[PDB]
Design a protein around this nucleic acid. Structure first.
Ligand SMILES: O=c1ccn([C@@H]2O[C@H](COP(=O)(O)NP(=O)(O)OP(=O)(O)O)[C@@H](O)[C@H]2O)c(=O)[nH]1
Ligand SMILES: [Cl-]
Ligand SMILES: [Cl-]
Ligand SMILES: [Mg+2]
Ligand SMILES: [Mg+2]
Ligand code: NA
Length: 327
DNA sequence: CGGCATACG
DNA sequence: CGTA
DNA sequence: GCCG
């Protein structure tokens, strides 16, 4: 079992679901408290279990697994012996965890904002609605749409949204393409949003594209919220439903075709997979990876990539299709 | 002990 | 600060 | 919290 998540296949569904979910609760709580390092260890330990080929049934099967020390091993031990981990249950029912979870789930609210509100005494969504002067326009949108945004987006919804995005993109710039990225590209059957990556096969033709796309979607009445030159937009879209509609989060990203493999990789995830890949690149290979490129700081050169396959080869990693990046 | 991904709006 |  |  290699130590970095990008060094091993991680399927979407696996054999240690309950154990990984418990560790991810502790990871989430660590983030709510600002402990990025402990969040990372708990996330990595959880991910290790996702990569295993069968269920963990005895503590000894953790020996030698990366990222399992005393704490994560005790969590697993208690789940195996008693079906529950007291530390995990205590977090789950704590007022602090439940409210930070509720607040950070709002579009436009991060840990630092939720925490300040928590310390001011706020606990519910209606508490926030009662004092709307203290909310950004983005948080106002997130709060208004919060119920719909809390509803999973279905793979069945994605096809309809991709077609209306393609229509607006095709008018904005003939020949531009729309690629589904994010969790659905990894095979997820449901998601918190839909993520698209837009490019054009003629380098440079994509310059200025996203405002043109956003203006056309807005003219069609499809945009309930967006932030407005730019290359990423975090939208709320009107998605038809029988007799009505629902609000859905949609992320649009534009990249030049030269950078498309890097942006596809970077936006296909998982989040942990990308963090680990970047960490692996920098710490093991001495190369700096982002959604634009891969930089050799000694040669002062960028790697040209024509595919995700190229990027894995550049880094000396076995290729992993998106469905095996569910770290 | 230092490190923990990386960038855009 | 928020977002991916 | 864990790794190197
Ligand atoms: O902090 C982040 C968030 C997101 N991302 C990258 O952006 C992609 C989409 O970000 P996302 O927030 O849409 N997450 P996703 O994996 O689609 O699952 P879901 O919750 O169902 O939407 C992720 O899969 C990562 O590739 C990061 O690299 N870092
Ligand atoms: Cl990036
Ligand atoms: Cl990007
Ligand atoms: Mg997504
Ligand atoms: Mg997204
Ligand atoms: Na949020």
């Amino acid at each position: 079992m290699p130590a970095y998540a990008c060094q091993r296949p991680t399927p979407l569904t696996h054999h240690n679901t309950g154990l990984s979910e418990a560790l991810e609760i502790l990871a989430e709580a660590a983030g709510f408290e600002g402990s990025e390092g402990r969040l990372l260890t708990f996330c990595r330990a959880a991910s290790v279990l996702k990569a295993l080929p069968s269920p963990v049934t005895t503590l000894s099967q953790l020996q030698g697994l990366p990222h399992f020390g005393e704490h994560s091993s005790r969590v697993v031990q208690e789940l195996l012996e008693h079906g529950v981990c007291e530390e995990v249950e205590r977090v789950r029912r704590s007022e602090r965890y439940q409210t930070m979870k509720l607040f950070t789930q709002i579009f436009g609210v991060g840990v630092k904002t939720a925490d300040r509100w928590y310390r001011e005494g706020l606990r519910t969504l209606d508490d926030l609605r009662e004092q709307p002067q203290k909310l950004t326009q983005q948080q106002k949108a997130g709060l208004q749409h919060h119920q719909d945004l809390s509803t999973p987006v279905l793979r069945s919804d994605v096809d309809a949204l991709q077609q209306v995005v393609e229509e607006a993109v095709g008018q904005a710039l003939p020949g531009a393409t729309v690629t589904l990225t994010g969790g659905f590209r990894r095979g997820k059957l449901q998601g918190h949003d839909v993520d698209f990556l837009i490019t054009h096969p003629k380098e440079g033709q994509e310059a200025g594209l996203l405002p043109r796309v956003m203006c056309r979607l807005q003219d069609q009445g499809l945009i309930l919220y967006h932030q407005h030159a730019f290359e990423r937009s975090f939208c709320i879209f009107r998605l038809p439903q029988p007799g009505s509609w629902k609000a859905v989060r949609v992320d649009l990203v534009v990249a030049p075709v030269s950078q498309f493999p890097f942006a596809l990789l970077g936006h296909t995830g998982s989040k942990l997979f990308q963090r680990e890949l970047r960490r692996f690149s920098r710490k093991e290979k001495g190369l700096w990876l982002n959604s634009h490129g891969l930089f050799d700081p000694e040669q002062k050169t960028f790697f040209q990539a024509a595919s995700e396959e190229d990027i894995f080869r550049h880094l000396g990693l076995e290729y992993l299709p998106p469905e095996q990046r569910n770290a």
